């Protein structure tokens, strides 16, 4: 299962 | 950056004349990801060719597997042709059943 909370650069 | 692709052409299974098999063209070590790969039968491009989903290695260089069904014979010559920004002319690698 992939990460649920990605952040922009 | 621009890294030129390494190429291996080979069968999925041990090659025997007259027996169904798969012809692979594995392209790796390249960047950027845009690339043109064709499998050739006697110089002419094979039409139903599939390929894996784009992935990459630890050093960020991309790799792809192109493959199609084929039946090895003694007369027919098989090859893979790769074009990429790092290449002036398309690179052609002949299939050699011993490699």
């Amino acid at each position: 299962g992939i990460w649920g909370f990605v952040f922009t650069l | 950056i621009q890294r030129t692709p390494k190429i291996q052409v080979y069968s999925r299974h041990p090659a025997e004349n007259g027996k169904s098999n798969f012809l692979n063209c594995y392209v790796s070590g390249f960047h950027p990801s845009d690339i043109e790969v064709d499998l050739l039968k006697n110089g002419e491009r094979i039409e139903k060719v599939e390929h894996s989903d784009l992935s990459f290695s630890k050093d960020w260089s991309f790799y792809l597997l192109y493959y199609t069904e084929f039946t090895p014979t003694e007369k027919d010559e098989y090859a893979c042709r790769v074009n990429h920004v790092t290449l002036s002319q398309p690179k052609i690698v002949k299939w050699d059943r011993d490699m």
Partner: protein
């Protein structure tokens, strides 16, 4: 042995018109089990292994939602990075991201990682302690400060140490018939005459899984690397892998040379001789 779950994400911008091409793939060890392609018709995270099809619609709805959020984050990143590096809108550029976790033979957390590249070069990466960042240049250093402010590392670490390992464990169970199976290499040796004086011995390893393997040549029980050739391990296309190693020898001296094969699927290393 040890196991890993890793996800690979690539976004390539298309200057002339439209959103970037976005491709996401997931692996358990050397087996791809999901994909997402922005150019595909479904616009869904799709199965690429039989054992993940066991998952119900809530899984695919959740993965699809998450991978689309990844897609849009990379879209925004590409624009940000273009500003950071003062590039024009005329060119195509790439962001790559890889993350995931390793577990040991005890299936418990061993190692986690998260790294990011722009145009094929290191940009920012999580350090092995999962608490700090490695910024390759001053542009990445801005991202580092931003992410330190927003405590990104803490939430990422919760995923890599916790959620990631729990998924891997779950996948390893449901897929045990293939994921927990080691396929030992099928080996043989071929002989090729170059001239009346010189011959090539080629040592083959076929149909093995996982991809990790070592092939070495020895002469009279001592290692030999000179006059040898070793191809990169390559996918067979059916989920297994192939490799060979060749040595050039004087015709008639073939028996001096032995091929040695190490693989997880082998209780003891194999020795081949012509």
């Amino acid at each position: 042995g040890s196991h890993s779950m890793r996800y690979f994400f690539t976004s390539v911008s298309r200057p002339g018109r439209g959103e970037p091409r976005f491709i996401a793939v997931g692996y358990v060890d050397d087996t791809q089990f999901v994909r997402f392609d922005s150019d595909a018709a479904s616009q869904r995270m799709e199965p690429r292994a039989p054992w993940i099809e066991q998952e119900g619609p809530e899984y695919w709805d959740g993965e699809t939602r998450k991978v689309k959020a990844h897609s849009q984050t990379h879209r925004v990143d590409l624009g940000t990075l273009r500003g950071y590096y003062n590039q024009s809108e005329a060119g195509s550029h790439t962001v790559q991201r890889m993350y995931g976790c390793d577990v040991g033979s005890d299936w418990r957390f061993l190692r986690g990682y998260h790294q990011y590249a722009y145009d094929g070069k290191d940009y920012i990466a999580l350090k092995e302690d999962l608490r700090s960042w490695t910024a390759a240049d001053m542009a990445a250093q801005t991202t580092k400060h931003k992410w330190e402010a927003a405590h990104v590392a803490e939430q990422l670490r919760a995923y890599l140490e916790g959620t990631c390992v729990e998924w891997l464990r779950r996948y390893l169970e449901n897929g045990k018939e293939t994921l927990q199976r080691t396929d030992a290499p099928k080996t043989h040796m071929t002989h090729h005459a170059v001239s009346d004086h010189e011959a090539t011995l080629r040592c083959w390893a076929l149909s093995f899984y996982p991809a990790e393997i070592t092939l070495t040549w020895q002469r009279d029980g001592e290692d030999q690397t000179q006059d040898t050739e070793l191809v990169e391990t390559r996918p067979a296309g059916d989920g297994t892998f192939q490799k060979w190693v060749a040595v050039v020898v004087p015709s008639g001296q073939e028996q001096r040379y032995t091929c040695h094969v190490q693989h997880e699927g082998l209780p003891k290393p194999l020795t081949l001789r012509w």
